[PDB]
Amino acid sequence: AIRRYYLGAVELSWDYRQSELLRELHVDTRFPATAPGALPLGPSVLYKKTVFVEFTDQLFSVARPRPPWMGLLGPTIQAEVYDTVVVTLKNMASHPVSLHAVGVSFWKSSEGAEYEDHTSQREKEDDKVLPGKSQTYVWQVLKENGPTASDPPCLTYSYLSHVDLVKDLNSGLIGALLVCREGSLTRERTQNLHEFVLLFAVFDEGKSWHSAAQPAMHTVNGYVNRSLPGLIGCHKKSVYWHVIGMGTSPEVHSIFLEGHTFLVRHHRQASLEISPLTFLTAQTFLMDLGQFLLFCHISSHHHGGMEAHVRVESCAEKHPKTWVHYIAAEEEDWDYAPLVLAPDDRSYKSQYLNNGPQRIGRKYKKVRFMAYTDETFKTREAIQHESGILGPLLYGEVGDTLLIIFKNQASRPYNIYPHGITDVRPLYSRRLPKGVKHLKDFPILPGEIFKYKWTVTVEDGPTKSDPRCLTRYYSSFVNMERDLASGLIGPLLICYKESDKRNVILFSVFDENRSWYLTENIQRFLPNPAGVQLEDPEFQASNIMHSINGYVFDSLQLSVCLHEVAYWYILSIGAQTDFLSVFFSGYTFKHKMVYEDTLTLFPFSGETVFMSMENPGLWILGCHNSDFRNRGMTALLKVSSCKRTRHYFIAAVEQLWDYGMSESVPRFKKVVFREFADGSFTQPSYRGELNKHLGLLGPYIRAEVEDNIMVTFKNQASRPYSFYSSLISYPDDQEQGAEPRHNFVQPNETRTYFWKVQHHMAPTEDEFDCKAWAYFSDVDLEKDVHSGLIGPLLICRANTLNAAHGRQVTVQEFALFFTIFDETKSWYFTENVERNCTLKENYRFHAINGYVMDTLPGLVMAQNQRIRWYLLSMGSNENIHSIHFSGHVFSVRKKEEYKMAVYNLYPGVFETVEMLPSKVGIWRIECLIGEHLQAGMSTTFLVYSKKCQTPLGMASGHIRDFQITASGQYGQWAPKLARLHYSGSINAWSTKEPFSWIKVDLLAPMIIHGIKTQGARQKFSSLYISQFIIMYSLDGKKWQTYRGNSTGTLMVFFGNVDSSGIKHNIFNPPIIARYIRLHPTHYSIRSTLRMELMGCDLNSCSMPLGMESKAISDAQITASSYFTNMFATWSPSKARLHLQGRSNAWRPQVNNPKEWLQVDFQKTMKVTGVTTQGVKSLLTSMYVKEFLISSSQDGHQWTLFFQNGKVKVFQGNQDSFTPVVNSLDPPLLTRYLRIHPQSWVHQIALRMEVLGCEAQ
């Protein structure tokens, strides 16, 4: 279970289409006149690429054979749970490369990423491997790394070079990582399976390492235009697909397979919705021999390199209805806005819907699908308002047959064919009319009729885990683009067996600049068909109707009844190209057996959602996408009939905001939600520790289910703003009609919201203890989120949220809002003249919670301790962020529980995930969209061990006098005395000033878990601090009050009751600081203090390695000699800090500076110091005055711990009883440590502990 891999970063030439340039393996030396050149050319081009390649051995002589199909893709690495991977990378390239694995565990020596991690330079070799050199890596695959019960037998992850994502990805450094549960060795029937990693990578050769612009290749495994070789699957079997998206900007890919459906998680999906670091395991099953096009389907034919062939080949060894429809393609005049709702117009509405100089406006002639009653087509079946434009609803359960008698009646040859059903032959015959490869592209003529037999089979239908019905569609296919654009579209449900089937919602941009009838419309509808323009980009874009069903800017109003439990069948077929993030106001539909709140839809995609109309009111169905919705895509919902109360006091207030100064400061006016204490919005409930991380985000508003939520919201701020969530449930008040729920807080006004929390606002029994929902202003959805109004609304479950904290407390919880603020769109944008004197790209910030560039504070988490992450993205389509917890994996839950390593955040979606932190240290949260990352979208978190409490040296004098500092001194009662247990005379700090403080500079950032506190006696009175508060700072003039564990304005700590006693307050969101400062607030007679500071370094390596705690068996301790006589035995074994009794320490058989004491940790350890002691014996005292230190990995090679030049000589031990620490400040690794005493007193005699932690 130690899997060894020998990757190397190799450069090669690549033209993308020519397979077998990968004969690197073999000097394929071309002779004639040659048409290449590792730069460009023309007759085929040839690009500089650096990819991952495998090797036979640890000496990189012979490269592996790589398959036809892998292309650029690195070697796939596989591991079961509990194995260990040990990769050796050898860089053989122009540029440097790292190896950063996703979805396994590693040790920071192995993380292959570099950032401000407080990491020894040895643990930073991994971070960048230079040309030549090597680096072994080692990955862990722990139990929390592996798949769940519901997961595939083997999770699809990846690994890449992580030195310059934009460069590294765009140049070919990306391979597959397969983390399977234990049983990567079961005899799969290796006729099916086959299994093919499917990199869906866009490469921007105009910004790979090699480049300067140039072009950007949408590829599959690095091949363009159907050229990928080798994708063969066996016939009546099934093939798995480990799918990895890649790209260094946004962009999504809607991936299809001509005759086929994908099964993922456990759902029948038609396309694969993928986008930068999306990871899937899809499986498909092959019933039809032949060759089928795998391809991305985005209208933008540029999206049109993602096209590869799959060949499938023989290998070796009650009663179902028949539904009948008479349907006609036939032309009509179509009105996009037949409902008098004009007035609203300082907003676009005019442009798309007016007549004159060069606008058709709103009445375009189109062709539709129209249902008739019989073969005569002289009479129409029942139309129905609300589904306008879209053809007749075509239902069909698994097993049924649909007879689509089709008659044309138009002015071009059309056609009708369903995407969804595999088995669609002609009726009666099984053979096609002419040289017709496929019924799909075969047209229907004059007014001919064709008779089709669509048969719905099982493999078309749902899958237990998805809904009773699933949403498809039909359309003419003689010319998909312009036919659909002319309006040939209609809905097709496909369902399961044992006010009926209800609303169909079609999100459709009809580009009337492509509709066959563009010309016909121009003649009839223009002032002078003379004014041609056609590419006058206003006229052109004036016929790009952003439609819902067939209506726009709110003409589709649709009535439901209060508590009508209604299904919604939802499609995105149009020009479109980008995903849609669809929402209903005030409402919450059920998606994957989970209540969500926005529903993201890729092009040519359809989903079923299901909701109960519990919110009386007028609502808008719509788009959430910024600048659609503006362009018409709206629609209306008109409903109408036919234990605690957790009160939060919240206001929208303005501030300045730099999203982070540090490292490189313009400041920006924003407006944000903050919590206040009183109705009298005057006590602003300042936050810290538990909420420092909130950033630009509103406060956590938390309810359980069935209690009530009450937000009093007061608008400060210049503009009017709103508190909306979509959990906000208005009651069946105000009759007379449906009413748009007011909302809208005018400045200074103070509106109040109250609503009970329904089981449907809360976790399914299969979700986590606590669900997250967003809330924001909605007076201008787009403009005033960018301004800054946004927050998390946790809805906890059952009896989970409790205490007097109103919070889980069982689990550490954080909220992360990823988005790219455009201060050009933020209201206060003109007030941000204040700069000095033409592109905006410095007015945009890629900011987690409003901090950019590892600047977001507040992320500290205990060692082993569940952590729940609410992840939100918002905004423009660009915001498809791909969030990674480096070195960690988490679990997402929707009806079942799946392990993941990168969550693919789509705007408007608010997922909740839980992880446990394996490894202590400082770790990174990225967005692996490389552009986003390098624009700052990153931060870090700290996981600490709760078991690394140690005295920071305050009593022990390790803290030198000069670091203690106060403010007044009484006299001779100096702060250099504040040292716990100090004795005599004057023996503490003391000040007669009321307002005072004492301050300790630890000299570097540290983790503090507590403070032990005394105070002395002066003759017969007792002096002590009975009540203090703690301030801390990171730089030294950035103090913040330790509002520890929220509690109130601040944490007031209880000091002492007397001289003697120690009071051991603890910091339970521990303090990360280097200056801590204690402010006496109540003292007896005099503020007076001896104190000790409990704490730890940042990486939690301060605890002993088990010398005193016999955890280092006497066999691991060994020395060069050891004096023994008859009554003595000063054997190494005994050289343990504080050991007592006879012969209690190590003594070399003779004293000389060549002797040494040695410790074999067995494993590699991170030694960060050495405490060291001497001994009293035979009432004659011996100890080691000076020493130096050697270290080793093998036990036969050695290096002395140099420092600042010339071999460190450590102080250590002036007496035979006092232990003395000696931190190693370029901290040692190695498994071997030797102590070399140089100068002593009477006799060399050593007792010690070693300080550090485990490594490797």
Ligand X SMILES: *[C@@H]1O[C@H](CO)[C@@H](O[C@@H]2O[C@H](CO)[C@@H](O[C@@H]3O[C@H](CO[C@H]4O[C@H](CO)[C@@H](O)[C@H](O)[C@@H]4O)[C@@H](O)[C@H](O[C@H]4O[C@H](CO)[C@@H](O)[C@H](O)[C@@H]4O)[C@@H]3O)[C@H](O)[C@H]2NC(C)=O)[C@H](O)[C@H]1NC(C)=O
Ligand Y SMILES: *[C@@H]1O[C@H](CO)[C@@H](O[C@@H]2O[C@H](CO)[C@@H](O[C@@H]3O[C@H](CO)[C@@H](O)[C@H](O)[C@@H]3O)[C@H](O)[C@H]2NC(C)=O)[C@H](O)[C@H]1NC(C)=O
E strand or H helix that includes residue 1113: none
Q: Which residue is nearest to ligand Y (CB)?
A: 748
Shortest approach of Cu ion to residue 1047 CB, angstroms?
Answer: 36
Question: Which SS3 state, helix, strand or coil, does residue 827 take?
Answer: helix
Q: How far is CA 5 from the centre of its chain?
A: 28
Binding mask 249-288 for ligand X (x = CB under 6 A): ----------------------------------------
Closest CA to 418 of 466, 445, 457: 457
Binding mask 282-301 for Ca ion (x = CB under 5 A): --------------------
Dist CA 1143 CA 1127 (whole Å): 8
Q: Is 296 in the site for Zn ion (CB under 5 A)?
A: yes
Shortest approach of ligand X to residue 1069 CB, angstroms?
Answer: 5
Report what 748 binds from Cu ion, ligand X, ligand Y, none; CB cut-off 5-8 Å by kind: ligand Y
- Among 15, 80, 83, 111, which residue sits at the site for Ca ion (rule: CB under 5 A)? 111
Shortest approach of Cu ion to residue 244 CB, angstroms?
Answer: 17
Report what 881 binds from Ca ion, Cu ion, Zn ion, none; CB cut-off 5-8 Å by kind: Cu ion
Q: Is 932 in the site for Cu ion (CB under 5 A)?
A: yes
Shortest approach of ligand X to residue 217 CB, angstroms?
Answer: 6
Q: Residue 1079 to residues 690, 876, 987, 1043, 1091: CA-CA distances in angstroms?
A: 22, 48, 19, 13, 13
Dist CA 141 CA 158 (whole Å): 13
- Which tokens is 26 given? 């073999």
Which of these ranges, 262-270, 374-382, 858-866, 1227-1235, lies near ligand X under the rule CB under 6 A? 858-866
Shortest approach of Cu ion to residue 910 CB, angstroms?
Answer: 16
Q: Name residues whose C-beta falls within 8 Å of residue 869's C-beta, 6 or more positions apart in sequence.
A: 813, 814, 815, 816, 890, 912, 913, 914, 915
Q: Is 265 in the site for Zn ion (CB under 5 A)?
A: no
- Which tokens is 939 given? 């931060």
Report what 929 binds from Ca ion, Cu ion, Zn ion, none; CB cut-off 5-8 Å by kind: Cu ion
Neighbours of 361 (CB within 10 A): 21
DSSP 620: B
Q: Is 224 in the site for ligand X (CB under 6 A)?
A: yes
Report what 932 binds from ligand Y, ligand X, Cu ion, none; CB cut-off 5-8 Å by kind: Cu ion
Q: How far is CA 660 from the centre of its chain?
A: 21
Report what 810 binds from Cu ion, Zn ion, ligand X, none; CB cut-off 5-8 Å by kind: ligand X
1093: left (phi over 0), alpha (psi -120 to 50) or beta: beta
Closest CA to 174 of 6, 3, 7, 2: 7
Shortest approach of ligand X to residue 546 CB, angstroms?
Answer: 25
Which of these ranges, 117-125, 217-225, 572-580, 695-703, lies near ligand X under the rule CB under 6 A? 217-225
Q: Which is nearer to ligand X, 468 or 687 (CB)?
A: 687
Shortest approach of ligand X to residue 293 CB, angstroms?
Answer: 13
Dist CA 402 CA 443 (whole Å): 20
Q: Name residues whose C-beta falls within 8 Å of residue 210's C-beta, 6 or more positions apart in sequence.
A: 47, 48, 49, 50, 94, 171
Report what 704 binds from ligand X, Ca ion, Cu ion, none; CB cut-off 5-8 Å by kind: none
Q: Is 862 in the site for ligand X (CB under 6 A)?
A: yes
Q: Is 164 in the site for Ca ion (CB under 5 A)?
A: no
Binding region for ligand Y (CB under 6 A)? 716, 748
Burial class for 498, CB neighbours closer than 10 Å (0-12, 13-18, 19+): exposed
Shortest approach of ligand Y to residue 879 CB, angstroms?
Answer: 33
Binding mask 379-418 for Zn ion (x = CB under 5 A): ----------------------------------------
Q: Is 881 in the site for Cu ion (CB under 5 A)?
A: yes
Residue 967 exposure: Cα atoms within 13 Å on the Cβ side: 13
Fill in the amino acid letter for 843: Y
Q: Which is nearer to Cu ion, 884 or 1147 (CB)?
A: 884
By residue count, the chain amounts to: 1256
Which of these ranges, 95-103, 140-148, 247-255, 537-545, lies near Zn ion under the rule CB under 5 A? 247-255
- Among 303, 359, 546, 1236, which residue sits at the site for Zn ion (rule: CB under 5 A)? 303
Phi/psi for 437 (5° steps) reads -70, -25
Please identify which residue in the block is written with the tokens 């029994």.
765
Shortest approach of ligand X to residue 1046 CB, angstroms?
Answer: 7
Which of these ranges, 122-130, 288-296, 334-342, 656-664, lies near Zn ion under the rule CB under 5 A? 288-296
Q: Which is nearer to ligand X, 307 or 1001 (CB)?
A: 307
Which of these ranges, 43-51, 191-199, 537-545, 928-936, lies near Cu ion under the rule CB under 5 A? 928-936
E strand or H helix that includes residue 1072: strand 1063-1084
Q: Is 1069 in the site for ligand X (CB under 6 A)?
A: yes
- Among 302, 759, 840, 1038, which residue sits at the site for ligand X (rule: CB under 6 A)? 302
Using alpha carbons only, give the angle 805, 809, 811 rounded to the nearest 5 degrees. Answer: 150
Q: How far is CA 745 from the centre of its chain?
A: 34
Closest CA to 331 of 305, 298, 365: 365
Residues in 130-159 that interact with Cu ion by CB under 5 A = none
Which of these ranges, 304-312, 337-345, 838-846, 1043-1051, lies near Zn ion under the rule CB under 5 A? 304-312
The 3-state DSSP composition of the chain as helix, strand, coil percent (nearest 5) reads 5, 40, 55
Which of these ranges, 416-424, 755-763, 874-882, 1228-1236, lies near Cu ion under the rule CB under 5 A? 874-882
Fill in the amino acid letter for 1121: S
Q: Which is nearer to ligand Y, 712 or 729 (CB)?
A: 712
Q: Is 193 in the site for ligand X (CB under 6 A)?
A: no
CB 173 within 8 A of CB 160: yes
Q: Which is nearer to ligand X, 89 or 224 (CB)?
A: 224
Neighbours of 528 (CB within 10 A): 8
Q: Which is nearer to ligand Y, 749 or 834 (CB)?
A: 749
Q: Which residue is nearest to Cu ion (CB)?
A: 881
Q: Is 866 in the site for ligand X (CB under 6 A)?
A: yes
Fill in the amino acid letter for 490: G
Dist CA 244 CA 109 (whole Å): 26
Which of these ranges, 423-431, 633-641, 862-870, 1024-1032, lies near ligand X under the rule CB under 6 A? 862-870
Fill in the amino acid letter for 846: H
Shortest approach of Zn ion to residue 506 CB, angstroms?
Answer: 23
Report what 1041 binds from Zn ion, Ca ion, ligand X, none; CB cut-off 5-8 Å by kind: none
Q: Which is nearer to Cu ion, 820 or 860 (CB)?
A: 820
- Which tokens is 17 given? 């289409």
Neighbours of 346 (CB within 10 A): 6
Q: Is 1045 in the site for ligand X (CB under 6 A)?
A: yes
Q: Name residues whose C-beta falls within 8 Å of residue 174's C-beta, 6 or more positions apart in sequence.
A: 52, 72, 73, 74, 158, 159, 160, 161, 168, 199, 201, 244, 246
Q: Is 770 in the site for ligand X (CB under 6 A)?
A: no
CB 914 within 8 A of CB 869: yes
Q: Is 927 in the site for Cu ion (CB under 5 A)?
A: yes
DSSP 145: G
E strand or H helix that includes residue 934: helix 930-934
- Among 95, 253, 359, 807, which residue sits at the site for Zn ion (rule: CB under 5 A)? 253
- Which tokens is 1064 given? 């051991």
User: Which positions lie near Zn ion, rule CB under 5 A?
Assistant: 218, 253, 296, 298, 303, 306
Query: Using CB under 6 A as the criterion, which residues of the chain lie in contact with ligand X when the complex forms?
Result: 16-17, 215, 217, 224-225, 302, 305, 690, 809-810, 862, 865-866, 1045, 1068-1069
Q: Which residues bind Ca ion (CB under 5 A)?
A: 108, 111, 126-127
Q: Tell me which residues touch Cu ion (CB under 5 A).
A: 881, 927, 929, 932
